[PDB]
Here is the input.
Amino acid sequence: ELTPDQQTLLHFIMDSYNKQRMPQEITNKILKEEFSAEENFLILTEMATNHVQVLVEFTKKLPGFQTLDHEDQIALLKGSAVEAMFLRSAEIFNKKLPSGHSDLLEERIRNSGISDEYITPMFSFYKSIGELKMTQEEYALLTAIVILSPDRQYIKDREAVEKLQEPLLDVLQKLCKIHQPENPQHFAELLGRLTELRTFNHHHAEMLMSWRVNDHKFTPLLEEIWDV
Amino acid sequence: DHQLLRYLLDKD
Ligand SMILES: O=C(O)c1ccc2nc(N3CC[C@]4(C3)C[C@@H](OCc3c(-c5c(Cl)cccc5Cl)noc3C3CC3)C4)sc2c1
Here is the structure.
């Protein structure tokens, strides 16, 4: 049994989460454009920039986020972005997409100048997330939880952030005992994946280092959320 | 100077 407040919170979040769209201007490129590495990298750069917009729109609308210290709000976006991005792509790769999209998107990522060192962990993480057979509820809440991690670099008031995080952890723990009745592990299995998810903070840093020594260029929004 | 992030946060 969820409380009446925890039912108000979860509606506030799945409303927030289901506005997350990738425009067709961009999805149509998966199938339409030529297959070359320059073109693949560019398709991903658009995809990234548009999603980073959508992520700041989601984060903005989290309960209590607006109340937070201004320098901390930034530390939260910058610390959480890589994780929130890889979690999203994991939802996308375990979801029914239009015909051919799953397959060709994969092929594009696989020929976009990303070393095999990092392609591998990427797709075995998507497999791993696939097996928890998650719901939109759980994607939304995990994403929300990841964003409001209080233990990122730079954060000045941890307690403030804890206070917004803990409510969401509560709702997710109670949802794991409801919709997965015969397994008390589901919730600690989820939190277990966040460890694997946290490795992409290194993989993605290398992905960029490598991209940059080959004179590739990113949008000014991506440059901001991903710098120093 | 993360102007774009500041901008996206304060908006509507
Ligand atoms: O086909 C559809 O209908 C459909 C619908 C939604 C939808 N959303 C998509 N995405 C959500 C975030 C997404 C893909 C963009 C990210 O990739 C871009 C990216 C990444 C990146 C990758 Cl490589 C994987 C995971 C996380 C990240 Cl940071 N690293 O650098 C870049 C840019 C080239 C510099 C991963 S692809 C997609 C497809």
